[PDB]
Design a protein around this ligand. Structure first.
Ligand code: K
Ligand code: K
Length: 449
């Protein structure tokens, strides 16, 4: 029992080295919320490790905030003590010779604690009711090990292909029953920044290939591997192929792998209908409100192009909305209104899609006329919805009634909880007619008198 002890949790939850794989629960959050983490590593007296490597691999809905700070027995350990390879969904932190010696020197008289703190942002790629999580592991051992650097390159015919093999003690391994945790992240150079654009996982120690498609031949990319047990050797990047060999020494220890807390976000579906419920209504427009403030969106970590698509899709939506609003009432009540609203709902979908691709964050604003405020618009089946909200009570504030129907007499309260999106509430109706799944809150409209 000379092994390092490692635990990870949210910063506000105490570490427990003796119970480091306990259930750490699921917490509710809103998209845009920041979760703070700490990872502790206890190195026992007399340890002389020549390799200490922490890898955290996060799910797609968590953006790693690249804000690592490291301490050794409480005192700051600066960046001369480690080498960090960060991407938008995690990192690999490797102690340098200097860092390793500092740890060994400290440990010769007592147990020492390394603490690594950082945060992630819950982003707009999160899927309602589907758990998000980080995952840290510590690779360690007594032998100096060369750290190979990821290679950059370009696509060929809009493709980059990873060619992967596995070896133990220099002997190739092809074992479909041996689980591994390798993640291959494709990043693009965007200005002075590396931005994650795609990813692929290998789940067994088998010869493996994956082809990233739809790439830009004029742009520069890199593939970064996050993996434990094995370590990557970036052999070559030529002719649109990245060749990687994973190496492991059989005499080295298994990585330490603590459990992690989970993060989740929730939603609600609605259907706008007339009084008797037999007609579902398009064009009903709503703000989303929490404590008198209004839901709004901003881009997260994304490429310039992804952020620019938010603005161009918004312009198209605005134009479609104006085209409908400028129609006469008789045209709005007829075929030209229905087709115009169909176009609005198409542009609304594209705008929402662009914000999701830009990894959006929510914010709450006091001004309901802010350019970036969320407006939900009922489609031809009366449908609209909201996702990415922490559990609690909210309201819809109507900004436009469907043509020929009266303005609602007040705000429409709704509740978000662990199954509000998938199962809904007692008095719900069907989001899609004839589904036999009553999962949408009915919002009743009355005709103008
Ligand atoms: K873990
Ligand atoms: K229900």
């Amino acid at each position: 029992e000379t092994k390092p002890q490692v635990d990870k949790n949210f910063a506000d939850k105490e570490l427990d080295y003796a119970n480091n794989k306990k259930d750490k629960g699921t917490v509710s959050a809103s998209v845009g919320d920041v979760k703070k983490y700490h990872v502790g590593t206890k190195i026992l007296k007399g340890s002389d490790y020549k390799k200490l490597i922490w890898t955290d691999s996060m799910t797609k809905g968590l953006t790693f905030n690249n804000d690592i700070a490291v301490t050794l027995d409480g005192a700051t350990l600066d960046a001369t003590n480690y080498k960090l390879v960060a991407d938008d969904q995690g990192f690999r932190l490797v102690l340098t010779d200097k860092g390793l010696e500092a740890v060994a020197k400290a440990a010769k008289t007592k147990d020492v604690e390394i603490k690594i703190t950082y945060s992630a942002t819950l982003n707009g790629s999160a899927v309602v009711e589907v758990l998000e999580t980080n995952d840290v592991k510590l690779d360690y051992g007594n032998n100096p090990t060369i750290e190979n650097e990821p290679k950059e390159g370009i696509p060929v015919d809009k493709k980059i292909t990873v060619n992967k093999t596995w070896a133990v003690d220099g002997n190739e391994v092809n074992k479909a029953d041996e689980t591994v945790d390798a993640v291959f992240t494709l990043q693009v150079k965007d200005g002075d920044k590396w931005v994650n654009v795609d990813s692929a996982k290998a789940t067994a120690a088998t010869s493996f290939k994956h082809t990233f498609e739809n790439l830009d031949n004029a742009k520069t990319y890199r593939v970064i591997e996050r993996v434990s047990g094995y370590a990557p050797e970036y052999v070559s990047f030529v002719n649109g192929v990245v060749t990687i060999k994973n190496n492991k020494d059989s005499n080295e220890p298994t990585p330490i792998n603590p459990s992690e807390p989970k993060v989740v976000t929730y939603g609600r579906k609605f259907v706008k209908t007339n009084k008797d419920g037999k007609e579902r209504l398009a064009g009903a427009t709503f703000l989303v409100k929490k404590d008198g403030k209004y839901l709004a969106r901003k881009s997260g970590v994304a490429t310039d192009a992804e952020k620019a698509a938010v603005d161009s899709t918004k312009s198209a939506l605005d134009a479609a909305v104006k085209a409908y609003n400028d129609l006469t009432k008789e045209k709005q009540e007829g075929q030209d209104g229905k087709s115009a609203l169909a176009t609005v709902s198409e542009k609304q979908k594209a705008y929402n899609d662009a914000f999701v691709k830009a990894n959006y964050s929510y914010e709450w604003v006091e001004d309901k006329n802010a350019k970036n405020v969320v407006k939900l618009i009922s489609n031809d089946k009366g449908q609209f919805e909201i996702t990415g909200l922490t559990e609690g009570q909210y309201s819809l504030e109507e900004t436009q009634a469907p043509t020929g129907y009266a303005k609602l007499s007040g705000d429409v309260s709704f509740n978000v909880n662990a199954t509000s999106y998938s199962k809904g509430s007692a008095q719900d109706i069907e989001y899609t007619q004839g589904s036999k799944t009553k999962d949408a809150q009915q919002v009743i409209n009355k005709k103008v008198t």
